[model samples]
Target: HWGYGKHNGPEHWHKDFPIAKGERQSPVDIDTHTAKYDPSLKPLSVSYDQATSLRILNNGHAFNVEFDDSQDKAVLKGGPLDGTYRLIQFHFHWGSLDGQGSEHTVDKKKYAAELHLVHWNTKYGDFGKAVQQPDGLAVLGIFLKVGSAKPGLQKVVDVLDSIKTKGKSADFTNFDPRGLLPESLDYWTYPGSLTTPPLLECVTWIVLKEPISVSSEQVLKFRKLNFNGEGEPEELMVDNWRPAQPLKNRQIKASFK
Candidate 1:
């Protein structure tokens, strides 16, 4: 019942997820001009093995592509991270309208969409437990602009048809997420909490500076996703992102000035 609808939406999230009011919460507005360029920042290291990709599931909130992370098959290292984080899943957030749903705003400008690749620190043993510690997780973020259709993403969009409703899942393997990333490894870094329930303040956010392109048609499929089952009133899965939280005293560090 917790969703983007007017009744149980983000505006009322604190009623359930108390940590929604916590400091260091995520999807904060990144004012690039105010970001201090850190010379010590290192280039990001990302490794993904297509063979490690396992399946895709519609968790009602979002459609996630899960990975077989039992080994270091897919991992993220360097760039503000002290340890290699194993890849677990990837998902996206968008609005019902174009240019409105991005969780993190750059100079207050919202992109058409945003991608989240979730990873867990190997030091913590498991994602659920890792999500509870300050240095237990690392998340890679990429903004999406409306332009040419992303050939790399068509594979994901095509599978959305089969997992249109809650709890639906299908086999999804041999796919690489590298094709979905932008060329630049430049990014901004910050310590923030998960943007959803539990609102765990454990993520080390690595948000890319470059925006990738995806077709408007492909973006529409994300909105068409359903939040309920066959018998429930259909509610579109658009506007699934939480609004930017207050920055408070936290600083946003940049790899480039």
Candidate 2:
């Protein structure tokens, strides 16, 4: 299976997923000083229904907390988004050590971890259909630093034991992803593609300028999860992040001065 290894990693993905080489790819380096201060960008409006959380799954690539997006229960508005964007699922990427792991870097500074809250615009119906369009997806990115344990994380970690192996999943419920965000709404915006395969160019990225802290112990627990299924040789699930892509001609917009 394609993974973040030397052999079948992002470099090799272009062979099978041609779009991996497409323009507007994700996780580009953000030069804060070079970004434009766009006052026209509206403040982000986020509303999440705790009851919309469905279940959690270990997809080998990363653990995903899926949500019920049948309705506009959990949705994002304003801030570089045109229409309503429904929350789909949220996942993370990290390395074995805290020195590096985040896909997007700020002035070449990598964070201990990165959180992706994926959403799709209702204009295209479902995420599958939305992914094919140019303005279909909107991803909210929050960088994580190592510090005191984040209380919101305990709920997520509590479920990891039951789904340690690939393809394993457990019933997860009543968790509000909004609680995981930082207090400030200030963010950097840009147009990009999904960091993963197919790498469709359909996302309006809103990366928070302020990062929250999670304990080193909590970050360590993420490595215990295995990408390989039971009965298979164990492969620790660390360093699942894709390398930063070229900026091309894209401009980074800042919501604050």
Candidate 3:
């Protein structure tokens, strides 16, 4: 029952999942001034097939669009990654309001929301096995700013009414996630963990420096999704983002000068 409530939030997560306090926990504050620009880092190579898209669901915590990772149909490569990583799912983390929602912050500044595109390394065989290895996963993070409404995201926003409660899902296919990405792939890379519980330290985070825009009206629709399923006391799914953790000994590398 770990949630973003007063009793069972990120602070209390360490009790059930000790790895929550692990050295490489994710959603770290990106101090751009401190991040070193690396010449070796190459531009990110992303190829996502629209046919690989499967469904969208409200999984009690956040809504996500699942993809068919049976093959390398949708894969991510380059940019601090070793080999090809198959795209498994893509989800979002948002705040109750427009001011603060993103898990990762830039210079301690928060954005309206964040998009996490989860992928698993083929070398590890599958996502289950990949989660155990340090270099098993590569998550692409895209920050969402409050500006003009994004046409790419409107397709997803239109389906919110169907999946208003937890455990509800509908078929979501033929969607190209590449359209959602910002024009520039310039990013800050780091070693981190999953922002939510089961906080495994297996992710190579590539957070885009440029953020996509979403209007205030579009963001409010996310709040309508309920954390609780039918027949339970309704709880709005808001502030689904975990706060930024300590930097510790990790160094963030920038792909751009």
Candidate 4:
């Protein structure tokens, strides 16, 4: 009854982490309308670095935008508060949720998608190695919501079509991520561990309270991604999100008026 490690292997993971029976997970639906919205917060920023070129930089995880300080002159400088930082790389984290996987869970809910802007602290060294150190990483979380109508993320959907499988990539330097920010940047901040293992605990999560919308069709295609391993005709590798961990008495702070 339980398929373990044979592609749709539920037993492989279930056997290891048996406590998943009833856990508090992330990306949970939070009747967004009932949530707080603060206008003082800005959902996005920009960097005009000339060195940043859109090239295929697939590193097994996913196709991402890689920033080489020597080339791109743009920097996504500034926020409503914490000053500014450089945009090094941005990537997606999904689950096998139905179609698209999500990483962050809220009060025990899972969404279809999550985008993380991986940045390094200027006080620290380079981003690649910095992520290896504690307190060297900061991730900006963007929530993907599926609705009747589509949002700007469809641009991402359009790109996904060109590079449908793993290792497939295309150049996308013309567009700016700043264009993708939601109207509200007021978010919940907390010092937490990385969603995956060697589970680094240095990350400061800036989870946006506002969710951007996308059409149901987009969600359909996202789920089509296949996870091919040395097993059955490839398991549905749709969502690759890690379930939310215990709060462990940690406080999730939201921006106040």
- The TM-scores of all predictions, comma-separated, are 0.98, 0.98, 0.98, 0.70
Question: Cα lDDT of model 3 overall?
Answer: 0.94
lDDT of 3 by residue, 20-120 (tens): 98899999999999999999999999887543888999999999999999988989999999999999999999999899999999999999999999999
Worst 10 residues of 2 by lDDT: 45-54
- Give lDDT tens digits, candidate 1, residues 38-96: 99988899887533778999898888999998888889999999988999999998988
Task: Report every candidate's CA lDDT.
Answer: 0.90, 0.92, 0.94, 0.56
Model 3 TM-score? 0.98
Q: What tens digits encode model 2's per-residue C-alpha lDDT throughout 1-257?
A: 58988999999999988878788999899999999999999999888754389899999999999999998898988999998999999999999899998999999999999999999999999999999899999999999999988888889988898999999999998887877888998999999999988788999999999998999989999989998998899999999999899999899999999
Candidate 1 overall Cα lDDT vs. reference? 0.90
* CA RMSD of all predictions: 1.0, 0.9, 0.8, 5.8
Looking at candidate 1, the ten consecutive residues that score lowest on lDDT are: 45-54
Total backbone clashes of candidate 1, pairs 3 or more residues apart or in separate chains? 0
Per-residue alpha-carbon lDDT of model 4 for 1-257, expressed as tens digits? 22223553432444444533223223233333334444455544545435464654433345576665443354543343354445677776665543445667665466677878766656555665756655566677887777744554566666765655556667776556665567786676566655543345556667776766666787666555444423337444454666555554445655544
